[PDB]
RNA sequence: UCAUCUAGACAGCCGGACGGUGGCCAUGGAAGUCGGAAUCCGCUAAGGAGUGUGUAACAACUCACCGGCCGAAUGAACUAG
């Protein structure tokens, strides 16, 4: 009956917004960490439908936590709170993947734009090994078939 | 470069009366881009849409009248706020699509034209 | 004063070591010949070395205006010297001859700019073969089709120092 | 830079005749007449075919078109007037003292009185010009209605009811107490 | 207090000018130069300062 | 009843308008304008009285009725 | 000297001013608007990884951009009589 977007760093504020639906805080955490899992590590849009009773938590999916995730990462505690600048592979298969993963929700252009549109959300990711993110994206036509 | 984005509006619109026979003329009233976005999405297949600056387009009509000149009779229809849909499907199915989606508290057809016929529909 | 135009042609003294100078034209706006071509050494010495001892002058000739009843549009490009500093200048007159538009642009800048005769350079004057290429309002307002405008407030001057009626500034 | 010709339009109704001789306007419509001397603006007037009636000035500087817009906005405003009507609206501002206005006579000449502004024994009497009509407004609390056809007169003796209930040695953004026009329209509004 | 109506109306008037830097003068809110002559039309104008 | 305005027309200067030289060589003949130099002296000509085709000033010239 | 301009300019009204995306660091928070860097796509007629107001963070309002009315020159910086 109510949904409740947040975006939450996986493995844990939540209690204010618990308090209106009246939901322990501690088992929304349980259950959004168990829903983060599914890479995890970094911050995700998650999901919350109350049903009166209790909330149900899904990871939606986001471009930003789709390509970091895609760029292989070795897990940081965060302690350090250090700048984690993201460097990544070329990764083409994965971009296409995530502009399919995408599907156009929310309605991407096209099936090539969603692509682009992806490549544009690695402003964060290196996203190529020689070059820089969507550049060539223009330039090559390939890939665009994957992606539909 | 002000005349370069001009020129190539003029060429596409060209394009696009020859493209599809059936023309519909849309009057937009206080809808958003995010429900004009939505309503593109669900025609791209079968619809076109244009919106473009009124003074700019009678040019462009009176520039191409030579060729299809029954498009002259849309210039009447042209003014205040349009936009143009051209579609292969010939009328109802698209006007029963743009008049239903997005309605909030907007868009209407005020013209069909088809085939060098005009409808008031 | 009442502006003529000559061509004045000069060139350097001939030397055994380079007979037949280049013979270098320019076109003067002068009242006579002797500052038609006092003015021509000095733009000389202007631009190349040379002066007035080191060179001759071969030939002047008077230009008159080829049409003195055509009523065209100049465009005239001017340096002058202001108090502080050297600026650029273009103005565009609507007359009917060469020395007459230059006579009014002297009147011109000595009334708008206190710029006198010794601070203004004439860089050139051409006539605008076409319309549309004139670009200040004050000469664009007199393009216009069927140019027509009365003249209000006559005013008649007398030759007796008594007037036996009240005068009218009808026209 | 002496603009050789300059003009205005006017837009004369259906039901109001305008006379202009030398520079004296005459304009008579269903709410009377008004009258206006311009012989201090030079300019030029000609009926195109009586409902326009172009303004012109020939060979004028900047001042002077300045002052043909002003003239046409004069003589419209004098026909918009006669037209409609003129209607301004005022509201009394007071923190304590109520302030308490009523209309009185000296010698025929209907005073406008201003009582307890700001508590004070002083009694403020502003003149009222003539052609100029005075409603103290019902349903809405403490509001006076000045109406006419002179924008001139109805406004000025506006202004002078305003600028009679002046405040001071006090901070008059703390104390502010008066008398303030709050509303500009017309008799006929929405006509 | 007024009513917050009849305050705005009333500050409209008394409280919503500007003051010009050099002469004091009290001017509209939207002015870019002084109307007095013996500042010489200045530009230099500050909003009137509010309370609170 | 109808708008009444006092139309005070006065002798326009345009092409064809008929002058009379009043100072000059001339003084006294009748040319015709022949164009507009600008707001102070206009192209004239006379051919039929002898006077030469010349810009010249307005104020050397009265303009008549006739055009 | 730069720009805009009858293919509609500048004022004034009216409408839209959107998605990827709560872009990446960093913070108890900061989602265009505490800061550090980058500052890219889609849909476009058009919309900044934001001009301000703005909230704990949001939300909300307004902008610079595009559109209907207007139909013709206008804006910024500077120079000197
Ligand atoms: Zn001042």
Same mark, same amino acid.
């Given at each position: 009956?109510?949904?409740?977007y947040?975006?939450?760093?996986?493995?844990?504020?939540?209690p204010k917004?618990?308090?209106?639906?009246l939901?322990?805080?501690?088992?929304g955490?349980?259950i959004?960490?168990?829903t983060?899992e599914?890479?995890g590590?970094?911050?995700?849009?998650?999901?919350?439908?109350?049903?009166?009773?209790?909330?149900?938590?899904?990871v939606?999916? @986001?471009? !930003?936590?789709?390509?970091?995730?895609?760029?292989?990462? +070795?897990? $940081?505690?965060?302690?350090?709170? =250090?700048?984690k600048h993201?460097g990544?592979?070329?990764?083409?298969?994965?971009?296409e993947?995530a502009?399919?993963?995408?599907?156009?929700?929310?309605?991407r252009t096209?099936?090539?734009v969603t692509?682009?549109?992806?490549?544009? @959300?690695? !402003?964060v990711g290196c996203r190529?090994?020689?070059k820089? +993110?969507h $550049?060539?994206?223009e330039?090559? =036509?390939a890939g665009?078939?994957?992606i539909? | 470069?002000?005349?370069?984005?001009?020129?190539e509006?003029?060429?596409?619109?060209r394009?696009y009366?020859?493209?599809?026979?059936?023309?519909?003329?849309?009057?937009?009233?206080?809808?958003?881009?995010?429900?004009?976005?939505?309503?593109?999405?669900?025609?791209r297949?079968?619809?076109?849409?244009?919106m473009?600056?009124?003074?700019?387009v009678?040019?462009?009509?009176?520039?191409?009248?030579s060729d299809?000149?029954?498009?002259?009779?849309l210039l009447?229809?042209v003014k205040?706020?349009?936009?143009?849909?051209?579609t292969?499907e010939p009328?109802?199915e698209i006007?029963?699509?743009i008049?239903?989606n997005?309605?909030?508290?907007?868009?209407?057809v005020?013209?069909v034209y088809?085939?060098?016929?005009?409808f008031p529909? | 004063?009442h502006?003529?135009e000559?061509?004045?042609?000069?060139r350097r003294?001939?030397?055994?070591?380079?007979?037949?100078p280049k013979?270098?034209?320019?076109?003067?706006?002068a009242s006579?010949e002797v500052?038609?071509?006092?003015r021509?050494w000095?733009?000389?010495?202007?631009l190349?070395?040379?002066?007035k001892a080191?060179?001759?002058?071969?030939?002047?000739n008077?230009?008159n205006?080829?049409?003195?009843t055509?009523?065209?549009?100049?465009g005239?490009?001017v340096?002058?010297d202001?108090?502080?500093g050297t600026?650029?200048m273009?103005?565009?007159?609507?007359?009917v001859?060469?020395?007459?538009?230059?006579?009014?642009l002297?009147?011109?800048?000595?009334?708008?700019?206190?710029?006198?005769?010794?601070?203004?350079?004439?860089?050139?004057?051409?006539?605008?073969?076409?319309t549309?290429?004139?670009?200040?309002?004050?000469?664009?307002?007199f393009?216009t089709?069927?140019?027509?405008?009365?003249?209000?407030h006559?005013?008649?001057?007398?030759?007796?120092?008594f007037?036996?009626?009240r005068?009218?500034?009808?026209? | 830079?002496k603009?050789?010709?300059?003009?205005?339009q006017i837009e004369?109704?259906?039901?109001?005749?305008?006379?202009?001789?030398?520079?004296?306007?005459?304009?008579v419509?269903?709410?009377g007449?008004?009258?206006?001397?311009?012989?201090?603006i030079?300019?030029?007037?000609?009926?195109?075919?009586?409902?326009?009636?172009?303004?012109?000035?020939?060979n004028?500087?900047r001042?002077?078109?300045?002052?043909?817009?002003?003239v046409?906005?004069?003589?419209?405003?004098?026909?918009?007037?006669v037209?409609?009507?003129?209607k301004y609206?005022?509201?009394?501002?007071?923190?304590?003292?109520?302030?308490?206005?009523?209309?009185?006579?000296?010698?025929?000449?209907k005073?406008i009185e201003?009582?307890?502004?700001?508590?004070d024994?002083?009694?403020?009497?502003?003149?009222?010009?003539?052609?100029?009509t005075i409603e103290?407004?019902?349903?809405?609390?403490?509001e006076?209605?000045?109406?006419?056809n002179?924008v001139?007169?109805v406004?000025?003796?506006?202004?002078?009811?305003?600028?009679?209930?002046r405040v001071?040695?006090?901070?008059?953004?703390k104390?502010?107490?008066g008398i303030?026009?709050?509303?500009?329209?017309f008799?006929?509004?929405?006509? | 207090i007024?009513?917050?109506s009849?305050?705005?109306?009333?500050?409209?008037?008394?409280?919503?000018?500007?003051?010009?830097?050099?002469?004091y003068?009290?001017?509209?809110?939207?002015?870019t130069?002084?109307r007095?002559?013996?500042?010489?039309?200045?530009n230099?104008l500050?909003?009137?300062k509010?309370?609170? | 009843?109808?708008?009444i305005?006092?139309?005070?027309?006065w002798?326009?200067?345009?092409?064809?308008?008929?002058?009379?030289?009043?100072?000059?060589?001339?003084a006294?003949?009748?040319?015709?304008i022949?164009?507009?130099?600008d707001?102070?002296?206009?192209?004239?000509?006379?051919?039929?009285?002898?006077?030469p085709?010349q810009?010249?000033?307005?104020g050397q010239?009265v303009?008549?009725?006739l055009?």
């Amino acid at each position: 009956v109510k949904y409740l977007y947040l975006r939450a760093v996986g493995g844990e504020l939540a209690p204010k917004i618990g308090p209106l639906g009246l939901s322990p805080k501690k088992v929304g955490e349980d259950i959004a960490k168990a829903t983060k899992e599914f890479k995890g590590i970094k911050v995700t849009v998650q999901l919350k439908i109350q049903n009166r009773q209790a909330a149900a938590s899904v990871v939606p999916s @986001a471009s !930003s936590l789709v390509i970091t995730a895609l760029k292989e990462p +070795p897990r $940081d505690r965060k302690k350090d709170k =250090n700048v984690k600048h993201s460097g990544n592979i070329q990764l083409d298969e994965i971009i296409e993947i995530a502009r399919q993963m995408r599907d156009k929700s929310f309605g991407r252009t096209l099936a090539s734009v969603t692509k682009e549109i992806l490549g544009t @959300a690695q !402003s964060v990711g290196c996203r190529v090994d020689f070059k820089n +993110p969507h $550049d060539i994206i223009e330039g090559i =036509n390939a890939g665009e078939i994957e992606i539909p | 470069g002000i005349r370069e984005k001009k020129a190539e509006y003029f060429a596409k619109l060209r394009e696009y009366l020859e493209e599809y026979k059936s023309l519909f003329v849309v009057g937009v009233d206080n809808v958003s881009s995010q429900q004009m976005h939505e309503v593109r999405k669900e025609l791209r297949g079968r619809a076109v849409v244009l919106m473009g600056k009124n003074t700019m387009v009678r040019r462009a009509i009176r520039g191409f009248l030579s060729d299809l000149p029954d498009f002259e009779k849309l210039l009447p229809f042209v003014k205040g706020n349009v936009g143009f849909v051209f579609t292969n499907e010939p009328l109802t199915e698209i006007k029963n699509v743009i008049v239903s989606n997005r309605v909030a508290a907007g868009l209407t057809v005020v013209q069909v034209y088809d085939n060098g016929q005009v409808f008031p529909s | 004063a009442h502006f003529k135009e000559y061509q004045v042609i000069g060139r350097r003294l001939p030397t055994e070591s380079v007979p037949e100078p280049k013979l270098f034209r320019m076109r003067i706006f002068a009242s006579n010949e002797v500052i038609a071509k006092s003015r021509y050494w000095y733009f000389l010495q202007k631009l190349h070395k040379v002066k007035k001892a080191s060179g001759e002058i071969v030939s002047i000739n008077q230009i008159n205006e080829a049409h003195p009843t055509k009523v065209k549009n100049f465009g005239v490009w001017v340096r002058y010297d202001s108090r502080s500093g050297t600026h650029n200048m273009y103005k565009e007159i609507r007359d009917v001859s060469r020395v007459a538009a230059v006579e009014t642009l002297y009147q011109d800048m000595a009334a708008r700019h206190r710029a006198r005769f010794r601070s203004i350079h004439i860089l050139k004057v051409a006539e605008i073969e076409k319309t549309a290429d004139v670009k200040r309002q004050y000469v664009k307002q007199f393009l216009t089709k069927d140019l027509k405008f009365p003249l209000p407030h006559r005013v008649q001057k007398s030759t007796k120092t008594f007037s036996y009626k009240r005068p009218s500034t009808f026209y | 830079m002496k603009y050789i010709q300059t003009e205005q339009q006017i837009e004369v109704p259906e039901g109001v005749t305008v006379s202009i001789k030398s520079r004296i306007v005459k304009v008579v419509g269903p709410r009377g007449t008004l009258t206006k001397n311009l012989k201090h603006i030079d300019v030029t007037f000609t009926k195109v075919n009586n409902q326009l009636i172009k303004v012109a000035v020939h060979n004028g500087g900047r001042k002077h078109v300045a002052a043909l817009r002003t003239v046409k906005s004069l003589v419209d405003n004098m026909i918009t007037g006669v037209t409609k009507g003129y209607k301004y609206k005022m509201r009394y501002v007071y923190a304590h003292f109520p302030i308490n206005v009523n209309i009185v006579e000296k010698d025929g000449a209907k005073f406008i009185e201003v009582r307890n502004f700001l508590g004070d024994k002083k009694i403020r009497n502003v003149p009222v010009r003539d052609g100029v009509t005075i409603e103290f407004s019902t349903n809405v609390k403490d509001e006076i209605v000045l109406s006419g056809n002179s924008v001139e007169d109805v406004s000025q003796n506006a202004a002078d009811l305003q600028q009679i209930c002046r405040v001071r040695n006090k901070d008059i953004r703390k104390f502010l107490d008066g008398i303030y026009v709050s509303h500009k329209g017309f008799i006929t509004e929405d006509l | 207090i007024i009513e917050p109506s009849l305050k705005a109306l009333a500050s409209k008037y008394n409280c919503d000018k500007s003051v010009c830097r050099k002469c004091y003068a009290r001017l509209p809110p939207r002015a870019t130069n002084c109307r007095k002559r013996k500042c010489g039309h200045t530009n230099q104008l500050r909003p009137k300062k509010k309370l609170k | 009843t109808d708008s009444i305005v006092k139309a005070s027309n006065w002798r326009l200067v345009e092409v064809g308008r008929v002058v009379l030289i009043k100072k000059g060589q001339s003084a006294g003949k009748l040319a015709a304008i022949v164009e507009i130099i600008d707001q102070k002296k206009v192209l004239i000509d006379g051919p039929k009285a002898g006077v030469p085709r010349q810009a010249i000033n307005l104020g050397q010239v009265v303009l008549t009725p006739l055009t």
